[PDB]
Design an enzyme around this catalytic site. Sequence first.
Site, PDB file in Angstrom:
ATOM      1  N   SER A  42       0.793  -1.215   0.000  1.00  0.00           N
ATOM      2  CA  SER A  42       0.000   0.000   0.000  1.00  0.00           C
ATOM      3  C   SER A  42       0.831   1.273   0.000  1.00  0.00           C
ATOM      4  O   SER A  42       0.256   2.362   0.062  1.00  0.00           O
ATOM      5  CB  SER A  42      -0.946   0.007   1.188  1.00  0.00           C
ATOM      6  OG  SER A  42      -2.131  -0.667   0.865  1.00  0.00           O
ATOM      7  N   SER A 100      -5.193   3.358   4.556  1.00  0.00           N
ATOM      8  CA  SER A 100      -4.695   2.400   3.568  1.00  0.00           C
ATOM      9  C   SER A 100      -5.845   1.700   2.842  1.00  0.00           C
ATOM     10  O   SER A 100      -5.727   0.546   2.427  1.00  0.00           O
ATOM     11  CB  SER A 100      -3.760   1.380   4.231  1.00  0.00           C
ATOM     12  OG  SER A 100      -3.028   0.635   3.279  1.00  0.00           O
ATOM     13  N   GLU A 140      -5.742  -3.328  -6.326  1.00  0.00           N
ATOM     14  CA  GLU A 140      -5.995  -4.004  -5.066  1.00  0.00           C
ATOM     15  C   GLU A 140      -6.962  -5.149  -5.319  1.00  0.00           C
ATOM     16  O   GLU A 140      -7.964  -4.961  -6.019  1.00  0.00           O
ATOM     17  CB  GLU A 140      -6.579  -3.024  -4.063  1.00  0.00           C
ATOM     18  CG  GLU A 140      -5.628  -1.938  -3.657  1.00  0.00           C
ATOM     19  CD  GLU A 140      -4.670  -2.419  -2.595  1.00  0.00           C
ATOM     20  OE1 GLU A 140      -4.639  -3.637  -2.331  1.00  0.00           O
ATOM     21  OE2 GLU A 140      -3.947  -1.588  -2.035  1.00  0.00           O
ATOM     22  N   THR A 211       1.577  -3.347   3.647  1.00  0.00           N
ATOM     23  CA  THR A 211       1.691  -4.676   4.211  1.00  0.00           C
ATOM     24  C   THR A 211       1.077  -5.645   3.220  1.00  0.00           C
ATOM     25  O   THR A 211       0.036  -5.351   2.618  1.00  0.00           O
ATOM     26  CB  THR A 211       0.997  -4.769   5.576  1.00  0.00           C
ATOM     27  OG1 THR A 211       1.291  -3.592   6.335  1.00  0.00           O
ATOM     28  CG2 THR A 211       1.516  -5.965   6.333  1.00  0.00           C
TER      29      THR A 211
END
Length: 265
Positions: A42, A100, A140, A211
């Site tokens: 991210s 995030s 994502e 992460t």
Amino acid sequence: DLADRFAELERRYDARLGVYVPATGTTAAIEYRADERFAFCSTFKAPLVAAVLHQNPLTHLDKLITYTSDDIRSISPVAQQHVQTGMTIGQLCDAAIRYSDGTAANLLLADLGGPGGGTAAFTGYLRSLGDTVSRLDAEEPELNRDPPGDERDTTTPHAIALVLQQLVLGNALPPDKRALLTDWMARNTTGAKRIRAGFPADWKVIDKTGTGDYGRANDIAVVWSPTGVPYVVAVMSDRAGGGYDAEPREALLAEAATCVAGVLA
């Protein structure tokens, strides 16, 4: 001795650690695996917001962007709560930096480059900052999952530090735009245990974390000494030996930053 300290961190955490701290007028560059590729995870959301800010007038931030609940295919703490309302671009920049939010980032990607060209346009934005090494290739959540060794969706601590040094310390964003990027990252909610934890509490710390799978744990930061001397700190790590579900060790990043704090003292 910085090499031997960083190497002990890699021994003790069973991790690969990448550190890059650009040379200042006063300080030499701190570098450890700084030119190896690490997954963005991210951390790309900080330059991503910069790209949206840069391309549009501040008026764009109040454009309300609509989305569904099926558009929520990732950890999206903030967008989660408007699965039909829509958010304003400024709020996605907000959610994407501070929480995030994955859906925010995917929508910001689409705003930037359209339905098919968001990751290419994000990558092109980095190119325009002189970063010819980083690449974003997936949205994502797939961008957090590429296999070890894959160049897709990777940057280097060197490249993302130099990018960061242009956004917050350089003249890549106009003062007002720069100010808002600086605000969002300094109000980040996710970075308490990484670079922030390694720096004395009267140094100012602004950061964006990442992460991902394979124990990936990243933090990119700009920090300001008590006398205001700015430093940029990029710390990236992965624990690829453990497999895709290997646990990230935030404390590794905090320790890396502690060593960095001890040479910039």
